[PDB]
C-alpha cells in the first residue's frame, strides 16, 4: 500500500541475518538504515526521537492543524479530538496520555536545554535520553552497548537530567 | 526465427530484457512507447486554480 524511498531489495547470493531487529545489536532493518534519503535524494541521518522531543512536535502539529481547521483561531484530552474517526481518536489519545505519564521534561524551556546538552551513533544518543538512569552502573547494564566505548561523561549526563527533572 | 533456441539460450545466460521495444510491450499488452504512447499526460493543477470556487472538491 504505502511505500518509501528505499526500494528494490532484489535477491542476493549471500543471505543476511543482520536484518532481525535487535536494538542491542543496532539492527533496525532495511527501512531504518543509518543513512536514509529524503524525497529529493539528499542524504540524511536517521531521525530517532526521544520522549521529550516527540511530545513537543506532535502536540504542536495537532494544534497548528486545529487552528488551521478553524481558519486561524494545553490539555491532552482536548487535543486528541482533532482527529477524524473513532479509530484515529483512540491511538492518538492513548499516545499523548502515555507520554503525559512518562515524559520528564514536559515543556520546551527544559527540553531545549536537554536538546543542546545532547546535541557516536545516532541511535545510542537517542536511547540515553529515553531511559532514565541514576548512576553509570545502571546505564551499561540495561543498555549493554555502552560498555566498550571508553567515553563516559555519563555521570554529568545523568546529573543534568536529574537536576533539570522537576519534583513530583 | 529460432524461437525456442533463443529462449533456452536466454535462460542459461540470465538475459535482462529492458522492455523498450514495440514488440515486447505489444505481447505483454501494455501501451507501447510509440505514437500516442510516446509520452505521458499530466494534470495541470496550476491551471485548475483559475476556475471559480463552487467547482471545488469537498
Amino acid at each position: 500500500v504505502s511505500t518509501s524511498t528505499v526500494g528494490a531489495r532484489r535477491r542476493r547470493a549471500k543471505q543476511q541475518v543482520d536484518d532481525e531487529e535487535n536494538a542491542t545489536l543496532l539492527r533496525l532493518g532495511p527501512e531504518f538504515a543509518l543513512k536514509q534519503y529524503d524525497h529529493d535524494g539528499n542524504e540524511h541521518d536517521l531521525i530517532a526521537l526521544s520522549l521529550s522531543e516527540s511530545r513537543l512536535l506532535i502536540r504542536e502539529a495537532l494544534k497548528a492543524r486545529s487552528r488551521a481547521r478553524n481558519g486561524g483561531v494545553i490539555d491532552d484530552d482536548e487535543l486528541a479530538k482533532v482527529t477524524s474517526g473513532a479509530v484515529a481518536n483512540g491511538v492518538v489519545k492513548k499516545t499523548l496520555d502515555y507520554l503525559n505519564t512518562f515524559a520528564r521534561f514536559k515543556d520546551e524551556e527544559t527540553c531545549t536545554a536537554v536538546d543542546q546538552l545532547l546535541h557516536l551513533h545516532p541511535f545510542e544518543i537517542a536511547q540515553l535520553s529515553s531511559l532514565g538512569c541514576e548512576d553509570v552502573d545502571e546505564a551499561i547494564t540495561l543498555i549493554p552497548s555502552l560498555a566498550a566505548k571508553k567515553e563516559v561523561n555519563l555521570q554529568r549526563i545523568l546529573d543534568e537530567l536529574n537536576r533539570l527533572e522537576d519534583p513530583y | 526465427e529460432e524461437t525456442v533456441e533463443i529462449l533456452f539460450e536466454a535462460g542459461a545466460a540470465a538475459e535482462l530484457d529492458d522492455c523498450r521495444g514495440v514488440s515486447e510491450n505489444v505481447m505483454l499488452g501494455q501501451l507501447a512507447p510509440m505514437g500516442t504512447g510516446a509520452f505521458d499526460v499530466m494534470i495541470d493543477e496550476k491551471l485548475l486554480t483559475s476556475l471559480p470556487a463552487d467547482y471545488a472538491p469537498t
Binding site: - | 505489444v26 501494455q30 512507447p33 510509440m34 500516442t36
Partner: protein
C-alpha cells in the same frame, strides 16, 4: 487480427488502439506477482483479503498485473521446462 494488421497500426502510430484490441477486446487477464522474486506464485484469496508468496514469506510487497491470458499460459509452459520468467515492475540499470 494477424501479424500484418499489427504492423499497419504501428505505421499509423495508433498505439492506444492496438493495446485495447489485443487486451480488453480479447483475452485480458489479471495476475498477481511477488515483488521480491517476480514469479506468479502468489496465492490470493480475495474474499479473505490475504495474500502470500510462500517462498519469499512476503505478505506486503505484492503487485497485480494486466496481461494477456495467452501470455500467462506461455509463462506457465516455460516454468514447466525449468525456465524462470521473472516479471519486475521497476528498473535498476
Amino acid at each position: 487480427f494477424g501479424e500484418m494488421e499489427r504492423d499497419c497500426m504501428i505505421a499509423h502510430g495508433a498505439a492506444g488502439f492496438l493495446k485495447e484490441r489485443l487486451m480488453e477486446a480479447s483475452d485480458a487477464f489479471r495476475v498477481h506477482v511477488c515483488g521480491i522474486c517476480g514469479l506468479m506464485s502468489v496465492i490470493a484469496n480475495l474474499k479473505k483479503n490475504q495474500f502470500e508468496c510462500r517462498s519469499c514469506k512476503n505478505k506486503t510487497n505484492i503487485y497485480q498485473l494486466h496481461i494477456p491470458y495467452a501470455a500467462k499460459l506461455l509463462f506457465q509452459e516455460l516454468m514447466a521446462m525449468n525456465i524462470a520468467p521473472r516479471l519486475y515492475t521497476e528498473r535498476s540499470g
